[PDB]
Scaffold this active site. Structure first.
Site, PDB file in Angstrom:
ATOM      1  N   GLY A   1       0.602   1.550 -12.673  1.00  0.00           N
ATOM      2  CA  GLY A   1       0.991   0.159 -12.535  1.00  0.00           C
ATOM      3  C   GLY A   1       2.366   0.001 -11.913  1.00  0.00           C
TER       4      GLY A   1
ATOM      5  N   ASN B   1       5.076   2.808 -12.725  1.00  0.00           N
ATOM      6  CA  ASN B   1       4.548   3.534 -13.873  1.00  0.00           C
ATOM      7  C   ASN B   1       5.435   4.712 -14.291  1.00  0.00           C
ATOM      8  OD1 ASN B   1       3.664   5.503 -11.763  1.00  0.00           O
ATOM      9  ND2 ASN B   1       2.088   3.945 -11.386  1.00  0.00           N
ATOM     10  N   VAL B   2       4.808   5.775 -14.785  1.00  0.00           N
ATOM     11  CA  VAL B   2       5.528   6.960 -15.238  1.00  0.00           C
ATOM     12  C   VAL B   2       6.411   7.555 -14.152  1.00  0.00           C
ATOM     13  CG1 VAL B   2       5.317   9.189 -16.381  1.00  0.00           C
ATOM     14  CG2 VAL B   2       3.541   7.462 -16.665  1.00  0.00           C
TER      15      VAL B   2
ATOM     16  N   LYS C   1       6.408   6.802 -19.234  1.00  0.00           N
ATOM     17  CA  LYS C   1       5.909   5.659 -18.486  1.00  0.00           C
ATOM     18  C   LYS C   1       6.825   4.459 -18.601  1.00  0.00           C
ATOM     19  CE  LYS C   1       1.700   3.051 -17.461  1.00  0.00           C
ATOM     20  NZ  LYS C   1       0.208   3.050 -17.590  1.00  0.00           N
TER      21      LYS C   1
ATOM     22  N   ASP D   1     -12.674   5.793 -16.289  1.00  0.00           N
ATOM     23  CA  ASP D   1     -11.977   5.930 -15.019  1.00  0.00           C
ATOM     24  C   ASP D   1     -11.565   7.375 -14.781  1.00  0.00           C
ATOM     25  OD1 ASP D   1      -9.004   4.354 -13.495  1.00  0.00           O
ATOM     26  OD2 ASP D   1     -10.756   5.342 -12.634  1.00  0.00           O
TER      27      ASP D   1
HETATM   28  N1  LIG Z   1       3.195  13.776 -17.162  1.00  0.00           N
HETATM   29  C1  LIG Z   1       2.790  14.249 -15.898  1.00  0.00           C
HETATM   30  O1  LIG Z   1       3.083  15.421 -15.613  1.00  0.00           O
HETATM   31  C2  LIG Z   1       2.062  13.414 -14.935  1.00  0.00           C
HETATM   32  C3  LIG Z   1       1.734  12.127 -15.368  1.00  0.00           C
HETATM   33  C4  LIG Z   1       1.036  11.305 -14.457  1.00  0.00           C
HETATM   34  C5  LIG Z   1       0.672  10.005 -14.821  1.00  0.00           C
HETATM   35  C6  LIG Z   1       0.982   9.537 -16.115  1.00  0.00           C
HETATM   36  C7  LIG Z   1       0.586   8.233 -16.481  1.00  0.00           C
HETATM   37  C8  LIG Z   1      -0.115   7.418 -15.569  1.00  0.00           C
HETATM   38  C9  LIG Z   1      -0.432   7.899 -14.281  1.00  0.00           C
HETATM   39  C10 LIG Z   1      -0.033   9.201 -13.905  1.00  0.00           C
HETATM   40  C11 LIG Z   1       0.692  11.761 -13.224  1.00  0.00           C
HETATM   41  C12 LIG Z   1       0.967  13.027 -12.823  1.00  0.00           C
HETATM   42  C13 LIG Z   1       0.706  13.598 -11.487  1.00  0.00           C
HETATM   43  C14 LIG Z   1       0.090  12.652 -10.707  1.00  0.00           C
HETATM   44  C15 LIG Z   1      -0.002  12.955  -9.353  1.00  0.00           C
HETATM   45  C16 LIG Z   1       0.785  14.148  -9.101  1.00  0.00           C
HETATM   46  S1  LIG Z   1       0.838  14.396  -7.293  1.00  0.00           S
HETATM   47  N2  LIG Z   1       2.178  14.830  -6.818  1.00  0.00           N
HETATM   48  O2  LIG Z   1       0.389  13.254  -6.569  1.00  0.00           O
HETATM   49  O3  LIG Z   1      -0.096  15.456  -7.067  1.00  0.00           O
HETATM   50  C17 LIG Z   1       1.489  14.986 -10.060  1.00  0.00           C
HETATM   51  C18 LIG Z   1       1.291  14.787 -11.451  1.00  0.00           C
HETATM   52  C19 LIG Z   1       1.672  13.814 -13.721  1.00  0.00           C
HETATM   53  N3  LIG Z   1       1.967  15.202 -13.287  1.00  0.00           N
END
Ligand SMILES: NC(=O)c1cc(-c2ccccc2)cc(-c2ccc(S(N)(=O)=O)cc2)c1N
Ligand SMILES: O=S(=O)(O)O[C@@H]1[C@@H](O)[C@H](OS(=O)(=O)O)[C@@H](CO[C@H]2O[C@H](CO[C@H]3O[C@H](CO)[C@@H](O)[C@H](OS(=O)(=O)O)[C@H]3OS(=O)(=O)O)[C@@H](O)[C@H](O)[C@H]2O)O[C@@H]1O
Ligand SMILES: O=S(=O)(O)O[C@@H]1[C@@H](O)[C@H](OS(=O)(=O)O)[C@@H](CO[C@H]2O[C@H](CO[C@H]3O[C@H](CO)[C@@H](O)[C@H](OS(=O)(=O)O)[C@H]3OS(=O)(=O)O)[C@@H](O)[C@H](O)[C@H]2O)O[C@@H]1O
EC number: 2.7.11.10
Lengths: 352, 303, 50, 50
Positions: free
Chosen positions: B20, B23-24, B39, B139
């Site tokens: 959103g 977000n995080v 987040k 999802d």
């Molecule tokens: N805590 C986490 O390590 C984490 C959390 C998220 C996340 C947490 C809450 C909502 C949406 C994504 C996404 C990735 C992620 C999402 C995409 C990528 S990336 N660089 O796009 O491959 C890397 C990790 C997270 N690693």
């Protein structure tokens, strides 16, 4: 066929509009504003682009433009009287989930069929902050004019204040050499010409009265204080307004434009996939925004502060005038107690 | 820009994927070595939506399966983001999302056997765990499966449930989503859904992790990507478009793959029960011997 | 600056003149009224009449 | 620039003119206090010796 007067709140960067009727008055509108601002109806000093203050005289039909177009142009800037300085009640617009991907995901391969929008809106947001900054900047410019006008108004009385006092000192002299001028002509006839005792103190008072007076010098607390502020205001005019760095932001604008430009005019589309580049212009504009943003308010806090300082000394001006004119009137009619009292005390032997 | 302005103990590096408005974000501690991400709340969340956020963190802390997104306690930096709203701290994984490994040219045409099965034993276990808490995450799209080099091997983990449904205080979270492509045809009618909705999401990915694309019409908008396979022959797990734009169906596993000449027999059958349009029919055979349906049966029979 | 410095003192010096003229015009005729009402009771000088 | 100087120096003498003229009356009217007051005492003993 409508009015709809746009109002920019220089305290929250808000732009509340009011569709005013062809009858309502500003005093009837100021109240409306209070319902969406919280500013006391009495502390609602709205300044226009011309820098001029409000206008209790005319009704609410003092914002109808019919020269350039008549819409989204003659926007007034609402200024709060109580708030000496403006913190951060202001807010901005979001990029929506449409542009969030571009910022959150950064490097993502999204179909151009969608990029033509997420990028478009992104560019609009970029230029948005920029053009939005100009609106805020103008508020300072308008407020500046108000301060520049108050300074002139305050000083205009100074020139007449010192001028009014010069009359007092000029009269005191033409009084001190007239009050005692009788004492010498009296002491040499306290047995020859005429000599009483009831007026021995009556006249002796006039001399002491002009003494406790003298307000020509009392202007010191004002002269060297109105100038210390006068020069101060023009000295603050030296400092950088806010649009000084606004150009740096306008540069960011052109950047985004170039990207959206290379999004359609680029060699074919309907299949393209990329978005990491846009992130560039996006992030930069944000940083620059908040920097000069609160920075503008800073250079404004001083400007907005000097006004109350002028309005605070404004009443002190009337004090001097009234006091100087007080003696200017008393000593004036004291001519009778110094002349007429001689004729009244003349027929003492004009009937012997 | 989560604001904060509280001195500067920790410090965020980069943001993350979905979630959103802001977000995080990858929160690393300039001082310490912890890089757990938390987040950030969107703008002025609606009063009614406020209960939704406080809800996620609730069930999130309930999940302790270190095989999926964990909900670690929020650090010294609590406070509240935009408006009255807490935060959501959680374990970070530099292994990137699943889409990364999928987009890798080396696996341009289906990943390798190792990684493949290594995803079933992982996502298959986590997806099951969530079902053991009445928590259903429909999802379940590739861009929601983070990876981590826990020790030496790659550890797949499910993440983000701001969409998933539950049973306790907080039925569902959101109706529509974004650029759908990996989700059961249930939510496409807004009709009474089921708990098998997850089986589809998982199945579809498993297929792609072998072929390298969707189990049906790749790069084809789900709008028409549905009506074309609305019927979708029984046990069918593939349907591309011939060079002549024609459409062909098949219940077999396309080539080339990475599975051995033995894992194919079960893999195909598995995908079949996981890719059945009928909701309450996907893996209907719930052998009361293992408490689980034929879906998890074959899986365990394989791994 | 030098020229203007005298201006501020020039107008200031004049303000004294006008201030004195007023404190003179109400003093010169102030005697005329007190005189016209005694040209036959107190003393009626004719040499100082002009 | 060079021309404005002579313009200032040309008005410079006109300043002394104003000052002198304003101070001229400032002095005359000043001592006129006697011809308006002292002339009353001189014209007072008219009957102070009857
Ligand atoms: N805590 C986490 O390590 C984490 C959390 C998220 C996340 C947490 C809450 C909502 C949406 C994504 C996404 C990735 C992620 C999402 C995409 C990528 S990336 N660089 O796009 O491959 C890397 C990790 C997270 N690693
Ligand atoms: O895209 S990159 O990350 O590769 O490079 C960025 C540039 O695109 C971006 O614009 S530009 O330099 O190419 O024109 C710059 C600047 O953006 C930042 O602008 C201000 C901070 O100002 C920075 O730049 C000024 C000079 O223009 C310096 O004086 C600042 O130094 S200092 O005064 O802060 O000490 C410098 O600040 S910085 O060192 O922290 O970068 C802010 O809005 C943001 O910091 C940025 O938008 O940034 C990259 O080089
Ligand atoms: O598009 S490419 O195939 O040309 O390159 C891809 C990279 O863009 C992508 O990196 S990223 O965009 O996700 O950040 C990687 C993902 O990582 C995968 O490979 C690493 C191992 O990387 C080693 O080799 C690279 C390239 O030579 C080095 O840059 C790495 O050094 S460093 O940057 O980490 O300091 C190096 O890492 S290593 O020293 O530990 O060996 C694996 O660890 C990941 O598990 C893979 O996903 O994918 C393409 O390379």
């Amino acid at each position: 066929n409508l009015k709809i007067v746009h109002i920019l709140n220089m305290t929250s960067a808000k732009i509340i509009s009011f569709l005013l009727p062809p009858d309502e008055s500003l005093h009837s509108l100021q109240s409306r504003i209070e319902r969406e601002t919280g500013i006391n109806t009495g502390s609602q000093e709205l300044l226009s682009e011309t820098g001029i203050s409000l206008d209790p005289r005319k009704p609410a039909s003092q914002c109808v433009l019919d020269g350039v177009r008549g819409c989204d142009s003659y926007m007034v800037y609402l200024f709060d009287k109580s708030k000496t300085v403006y913190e951060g009640p202001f807010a901005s617009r979001s990029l929506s989930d449409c542009v969030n991907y571009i910022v959150q995901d950064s490097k993502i391969q999204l179909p151009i069929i969608q990029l033509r929008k997420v990028w478009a809106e992104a560019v609009h947001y970029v230029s948005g902050l920029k053009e939005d900054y100009s609106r805020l900047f103008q508020g300072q410019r308008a407020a500046m004019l108000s301060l520049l006008r108050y300074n002139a108004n305050l000083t205009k009385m100074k020139n007449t204040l010192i001028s009014a006092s010069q009359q007092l000192k000029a009269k005191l002299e033409f009084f001190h050499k007239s009050i005692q001028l009788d004492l010498e002509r009296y002491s040499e006839q306290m047995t020859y010409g005429i000599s009483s005792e009831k007026m021995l103190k009556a006249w002796k008072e006039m001399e002491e009265k002009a003494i406790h007076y003298a307000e020509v010098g009392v202007i010191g607390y004002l002269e060297d204080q109105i100038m210390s502020l006068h020069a101060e205001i023009m000295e603050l005019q030296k400092s950088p307004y806010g649009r000084r760095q606004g150009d740096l932001m306008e540069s960011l604008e052109q950047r985004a434009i170039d990207l959206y430009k290379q999004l359609k005019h680029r060699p074919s589309d309907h299949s393209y996939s990329d978005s990491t580049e846009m992130v560039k212009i996006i992030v930069h504009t944000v940083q620059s925004q908040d920097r000069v943003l609160k920075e503008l308010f800073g250079h404004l806090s001083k400007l907005l502060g000097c006004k109350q300082k002028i309005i605070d000394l404004l009443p002190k001006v009337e004090v001097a005038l009234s006091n100087i004119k007080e003696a200017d009137n008393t000593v004036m009619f004291m001519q009778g107690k110094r002349q007429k009292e001689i004729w009244h005390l003349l027929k003492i032997a004009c009937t012997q | 820009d989560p604001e904060f302005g509280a001195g500067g103990p920790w410090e965020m590096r980069e943001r993350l994927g979905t979630g959103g408005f802001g977000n995080v974000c990858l929160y690393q501690h300039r001082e310490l070595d912890l890089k757990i991400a938390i987040k950030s709340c969107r703008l002025e969340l609606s009063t009614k939506n406020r209960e939704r956020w406080c809800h996620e963190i609730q069930i999130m802390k309930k999940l302790n399966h270190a095989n999926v997104v964990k909900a670690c306690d929020v650090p010294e930096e609590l406070n509240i983001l935009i408006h009255d709203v807490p935060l959501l701290a959680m374990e970070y994984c530099s292994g990137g999302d699943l889409r990364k490994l999928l987009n890798k040219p080396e696996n341009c045409c289906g990943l390798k056997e190792s990684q493949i099965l290594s995803l079933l034993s992982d996502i298959g276990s986590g997806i099951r765990y969530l079902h053991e808490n009445k928590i259903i995450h429909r999802d379940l799209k590739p861009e929601n499966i983070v990876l981590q080099d826990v020790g030496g091997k790659i550890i797949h983990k499910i993440i983000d449930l701001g969409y998933a449904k539950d049973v306790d205080q907080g039925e569902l979270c959101t109706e529509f989503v974004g650029t759908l492509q990996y989700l059961a045809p249930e939510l496409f009618e807004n009709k009474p859904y089921t708990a098998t909705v997850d089986y589809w999401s998982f199945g579809t990915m498993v297929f792609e992790c072998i072929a390298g694309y969707r189990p049906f019409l790749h790069h084809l908008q789900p709008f028409t990507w549905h009506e074309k396979i609305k019927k979708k022959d029984p046990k069918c797990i593939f349907a591309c478009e011939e060079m002549s734009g024609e459409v062909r169906f098949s219940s077999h596993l396309p080539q080339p793959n990475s599975l051995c000449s033995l894992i194919v027999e079960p893999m195909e059958n598995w995908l079949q029960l996981m890719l059945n349009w009928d909701p309450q029919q996907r893996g209907g055979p719930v052998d009361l011997t293992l408490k689980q349906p034929r879906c998890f049966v074959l899986m365990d029979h394989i791994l």
